[PDB]
Amino acid sequence: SKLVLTGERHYTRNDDIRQSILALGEPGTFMTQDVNIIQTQIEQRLPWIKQVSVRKQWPDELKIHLVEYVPIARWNDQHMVDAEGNTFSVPPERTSKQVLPMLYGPEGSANEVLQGYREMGQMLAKDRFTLKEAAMTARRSWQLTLNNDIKLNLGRGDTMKRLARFVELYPVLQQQAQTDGKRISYVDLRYDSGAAVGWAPLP
């Protein structure tokens, strides 16, 4: 029996597969096992695998082809979400030097959060602001973190009007922080037509 492993692999390493197999049969090998259980075992021991196919090719060969999920953001913190809203996780020894945007929300809200992250990032992009973090509460209030580390508190209201107010007001907040030797730390927008600004000393 030869075991042929194929597909584009960014997180899986070969011991992940062989362990899934031995942990089911024995220290001996694998051929006329059920291909559907070899497939199910691998789906369950490797939660970052989005698709795996297991197929017997004679002479004597078992061929496994892998498709991995691809993260576009960390989800809450220890997990990850892809561009279609799917949730998965990767042992953090293997992801500890990646730098991804950061989403947060209640346990089944990834798609909703990712949608809001997309829409709001679009608007901030029209003014060359870029979104590093986005958190949504069970009540569906929003807080954003720019790449320049300013936090924005949007609460629950028309988040897009409050977003536009930040951008309008930003040049004076920056002149003001410029003048007093401080840095902008956050901008609370949860008012009818104003903003409260918290400062911080310069790093």
Binding site: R139, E168, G194
Partner: peptide, 24 residues
């Protein structure tokens, strides 16, 4: 919890010591 601070903030124009307020 933070619902209270949203009304406190939105319904009455209240802030927190140290913050600067801007009205447009």
């Amino acid at each position: 919890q933070e619902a209270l601070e949203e009304r406190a903030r939105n319904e009455l124009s209240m802030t927190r010591p140290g913050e600067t307020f801007y009205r447009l």
